[PDB]
From Swiss-Prot, chain C:
Medical condition linked: Inclusion body myopathy with early-onset Paget disease with or without frontotemporal dementia 1: An autosomal dominant disease characterized by disabling muscle weakness clinically resembling to limb girdle muscular dystrophy, osteolytic bone lesions consistent with Paget disease, and premature frontotemporal dementia. Clinical features show incomplete penetrance.
Similarity comment text for this entry: Belongs to the AAA ATPase family.
Gene: VCP
Location of the protein in the cell: Cytoplasm, Cytosol; Endoplasmic reticulum; Nucleus; Cytoplasm, Stress granule
Post-translational modification: Phosphorylated by tyrosine kinases in response to T-cell antigen receptor activation. Phosphorylated in mitotic cells.
Effect of substituting residue 33 to A: Minor effect on affinity for ATP and ADP
Protein name: Transitional endoplasmic reticulum ATPase
Superkingdom field: Eukaryota
Free-text note on domains in this protein's UniProt record: The PIM (PUB-interaction motif) motif mediates interaction with the PUB domain of RNF31.
Disulfide bonds: none
Subunit structure: Homohexamer. Forms a ring-shaped particle of 12.5 nm diameter, that displays 6-fold radial symmetry. Part of a ternary complex containing STX5A, NSFL1C and VCP. NSFL1C forms a homotrimer that binds to one end of a VCP homohexamer. The complex binds to membranes enriched in phosphatidylethanolamine-containing lipids and promotes Golgi membrane fusion. Binds to a heterodimer of NPLOC4 and UFD1, binding to this heterodimer inhibits Golgi-membrane fusion. Interaction with VCIP135 leads to dissociation of the complex via ATP hydrolysis by VCP.
Impact upon substituting residue 90 to A: Abolishes interaction with NPLOC4
Protein purpose: Necessary for the fragmentation of Golgi stacks during mitosis and for their reassembly after mitosis. Involved in the formation of the transitional endoplasmic reticulum (tER). The transfer of membranes from the endoplasmic reticulum to the Golgi apparatus occurs via 50-70 nm transition vesicles which derive from part-rough, part-smooth transitional elements of the endoplasmic reticulum (tER). Vesicle budding from the tER is an ATP-dependent process.
Length: 753, 135, 110
């Protein structure tokens, strides 16, 4: 449009339907009494408005009023001039049908109240959303539909009454138009919608942009949407923005027992839609709808492929028709991946956003929800670990469940509607979150230790490690610009080679707690198979998830045991292990996506590690883990106890002194054993059962203290005497000593000029 | 009251069964009709249970569309045994029952005792009928 | 209303056909001579019997009549409270159709 931005100020006239024209439009529109001044607007707008221009006094701002924008459906600054009425078509029998809103609320019959305005002139604004002033009757006699039946100003004199349809249809077209999915409903992907729609329009608006350019609009491309992406929402938005007959075609629905019956039905539907309008076809479940007749020997699949190559690839078979192929997954290597003929051209269309989860949740809450108490910070936190239309459905379910809990907490309220309960039904962020946890799947809620409230809380210490991990995360989080200025990329992963089970799993949990996304826990056990194909599958899954989500800590167990620096062992096992090691190196190397990823290899034996992995970049940071310390043991035990239990009799200093630097895993085991002893020794587990409400409800009139009080040093000492705490000090010491000797042999001097 | 039904008189209703069903689903979304239980609900709607061809899958898809295309004004949907238990209609798979279950009471001595009381009210079972024994 | 329900015993009046209108019906509400206590029923059912009552003579706290209970299908001891009822319509003229069962089986012109 024009480079000068139109000032959207207050209109000179108070009424929305009446606006002041600009300087050029003060005398351009001729004022005629016998002919209605139909202003050329948006969506075939032929409105008989006044020629009242405030340009005779000053330069009236070109801006609509508060309701005029929703009335005319025209953008601010759009040029509107007095032109012939295009919405007013004169015909042989052009009569305006009545509606229930035109009948309901008006005195007498709808025709009786309409004929006063249907005789010569309506004297009211016949438009959707416009301020329609009807003189007399104290009601609005107008169709509660998209527009008038015959025309805005049809050829119907007073002798030609408004012949209504068979039924008065009201509040039906408006409901659908409101339900018509706006292109902005998906954040970021509205750019894709704009790209496709502009490709359609400009090539049509400018035939030079289509023929003289020599490039026709693409017939269709694969939907870059993952499973359950709510691609139905994408199709609905396309239909709402681009007026077309949406043709949803489920891939499963395209599976038939009669060979060709599904194909013939699909061809018939395509032809019917083409004859119907410049429609849009939605190929649902298209990615799995065929194997491309290459992997599968199914003659039915081959016939379907042939029909598609005939139907989808048809000679101008899309008369302004869009074959939108709703791919099951954006990256699924589908039949059309094998046969790139459906996506014979993929449109450069701007894909979605990341806060689009939060944005869509905000839209849903702003759609009709009154959950004012639902905190937006909680919404953002949930949207950090959420999905697309699926997360929107989860939010809707949480709202419904919280509203049910609130409404069920209230009576029927049949006498009067509780305005506070019904209106402004502020579903609390706590209430909404609880309803979501009850509704949404609970598997992903505990998997991300970012939800677990242990920021190195379960294992007190490792402050240097925690700081290093936090710095690594915040690098392309807080100051990615600083990283660019230095021009340094982040590391791949950490080789935390310390005592086994000392908290390495707890280390991964704390890392995820510092993280915001999930991690990838792996074990060397999954690597073994009779047929050597497991390594490629595991690596592919890891890469896809890392390509899918943010850095997932590759918490690989038996990593050193799996690799063992190759070595060349005998038998099929040795060759398979060498192949697996090479595959793992390739996964950790090559033209990687450079996406957010983290690696956590479990190496209880640093000498059993891979030599190639030891190279920087292959494992990046080879931060061999240390073993537990007595002060560290005291801190970790204190934190673990502080989580559940409160004990005064059992002194933490005495526990630390008795620990004498016991194993951190052993310390956790001792804590669990003491907790179990306290729970069993609990009076509610002991005294209440003892009396069992025979003469008194419990064996004591008052309840006992917390279970920890008083599991004294006796219970802990008994558990410790039962406990092993028998880590091989010589072996772990030798391993750490060898690692340290290598590191010392690895270091150099200052060498500063 | 109002909106009795569609014509639905061809005795065959090949695609007309789907057409009338869609019309009823759309009509109740802007009306206040009653939830008239669908006679032969499983028979008319195979719901991915009868044939591996097109009728059963079409019935399931139409059920999904109706549950995702009707307002909360009538909700004329068969409960419990709507379609066959093995493959019920997608009225629960679509909006309406996709997030909530049914608080069905288990078959206990309460139901048996209530049935016995109803039967005793309807007809004289015995002078000393042991309804507790029957339950 | 109250959360605990009860059961309504037989009418205090010995005669079932003698359903005396309660004093509260003419006191709390302007019960005229041509209208009585309108009984609400199930599935949008309502019936009122035009009977002259004397609230200044005797305020008999009798229960509902057997015929009235059968016609209104009123539950035993249901809480008789006036609440907002938005499902009541009105009309001007109707056609009082006779019972088809009485026409058939009767000798001659029923």
């Amino acid at each position: 449009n024009r480079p000068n931005r139109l000032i959207v100020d207050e209109a000179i006239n108070e009424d929305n339907s009446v606006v002041s024209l600009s300087q050029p439009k003060m005398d351009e529109l001729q004022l005629f009494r016998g002919d209605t001044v139909l202003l050329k607007g948006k969506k075939r707008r032929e409105a008989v408005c006044i020629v009242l221009s405030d340009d005779t006094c000053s330069d009236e701002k070109i801006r609509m009023n508060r309701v005029v924008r929703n009335n005319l459906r025209v953008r601010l600054g759009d040029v509107i001039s007095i032109q012939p009425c295009p919405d007013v078509k004169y015909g042989k029998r052009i009569h305006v049908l009545p509606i229930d809103d035109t009948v309901e609320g008006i005195t007498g019959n709808l025709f009786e109240v309409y004929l006063k305005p249907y005789f010569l002139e309506a004297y009211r604004p016949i438009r959707k959303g416009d301020i329609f002033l009807v003189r007399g009757g104290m009601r609005a006699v107008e169709f509660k539909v998209v527009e008038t039946d015959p025309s805005p100003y049809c050829i119907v004199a007073p002798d030609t009454v408004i012949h209504c349809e068979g039924e008065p249809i009201k509040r039906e077209d408006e409901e659908e138009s409101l339900n018509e999915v706006g292109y902005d409903d998906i954040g970021g992907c509205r750019k894709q919608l704009a790209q496709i729609k502009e490709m359609v329009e400009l090539p049509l608006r400018h035939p030079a942009l289509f023929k003289a350019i020599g490039v026709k609009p693409p017939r269709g491309i694969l939907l870059y949407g993952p499973p359950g992406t709510g691609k139905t929402l994408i199709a609905r938005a396309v239909a709402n923005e681009t007026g077309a007959f949406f043709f949803l075609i489920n891939g499963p629905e395209i599976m038939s027992k009669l060979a060709g019956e599904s194909e013939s039905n699909l061809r018939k539907a395509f032809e019917e839609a083409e004859k119907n309008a410049p429609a849009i076809i939605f190929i649902d479940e298209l990615d799995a709808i065929a194997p491309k007749r290459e992997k599968t020997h199914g003659e039915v699949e081959r016939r379907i492929v042939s029909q598609l190559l005939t139907l989808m690839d048809g000679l101008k078979q899309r008369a302004h028709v869009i074959v939108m192929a709703a791919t099951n997954r954006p990256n699924s290597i589908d039949p059309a991946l094998r046969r790139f003929g459906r996506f014979d051209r993929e449109v450069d269309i701007g894909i979605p956003d990341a806060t689009g989860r939060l944005e869509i949740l905000q839209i849903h809450t702003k759609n009709m929800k009154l959950a004012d108490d639902v905190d937006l910070e909680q919404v953002a936190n949930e949207t950090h670990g959420h999905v697309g239309a699926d997360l929107a459905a989860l939010c809707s379910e949480a709202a419904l469940q919280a509203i049910r809990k609130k409404m069920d907490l209230i009576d029927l309220e049949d006498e009067t509607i509780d305005a506070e309960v019904m209106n402004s039904l502020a579903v609390t962020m706590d209430d909404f979150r609880w309803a979501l946890s009850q509704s949404n799947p609970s598997a992903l809620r505990e998997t991300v230790v970012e939800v677990p409230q242990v920021t190195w809380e379960d294992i007190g210490g490792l402050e240097d490690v925690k700081r290093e991990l936090q710095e690594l995360v915040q690098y392309p989080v807080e100051h990615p610009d600083k990283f660019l200025k230095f021009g340094m990329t982040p590391s791949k992963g950490v080789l935390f080679y310390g005592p086994p089970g000392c908290g390495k799993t707890l280390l991964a949990k704390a890392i995820a707690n510092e993280c915001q996304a999930n991690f990838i826990s792996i074990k060397g056990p999954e690597l073994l198979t009779m047929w050597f194909g497991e390594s490629e599958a595991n690596v592919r899954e890891i890469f896809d998830k890392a390509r899918q989500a943010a850095p997932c800590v590759l918490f690989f167990d038996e990593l050193d045991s799996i690799a063992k620096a190759r070595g060349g062992n005998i038998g099929d096992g040795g060759g398979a292990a060498d192949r697996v090691i090479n595959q793992i190196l390739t996964e950790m190397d090559g033209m990687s996506t450079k996406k957010n990823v983290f690696i956590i290899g479990a190496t209880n034996r640093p000498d059993i590690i891979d030599p190639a992995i030891l190279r920087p970049g292959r494992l990046d940071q080879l931060i061999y883990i240390p073993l537990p310390d007595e002060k560290s043991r005291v801190a970790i035990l204190k934190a673990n106890l502080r989580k559940s239990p409160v004990a005064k009799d059992v002194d933490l200093e005495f526990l630390a002194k008795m620990t004498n630097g016991f194993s951190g895993a052993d310390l956790t085991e001792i804590c669990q054993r003491a907790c179990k002893l306290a729970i069993r020794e609990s009076i509610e587990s002991e005294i209440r059962r003892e009396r069992e409400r025979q003469t008194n409800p419990s064996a004591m009139e008052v309840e006992e203290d917390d279970p920890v009080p008083e599991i004294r040093r006796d219970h802990f000492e008994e558990a410790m005497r039962f406990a092993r705490r028998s880590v091989s000090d010589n072996d772990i010491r030798k391993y750490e000593m060898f690692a340290q000797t290598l590191q010392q042999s690895r270091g150099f001097g200052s060498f500063r000029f």
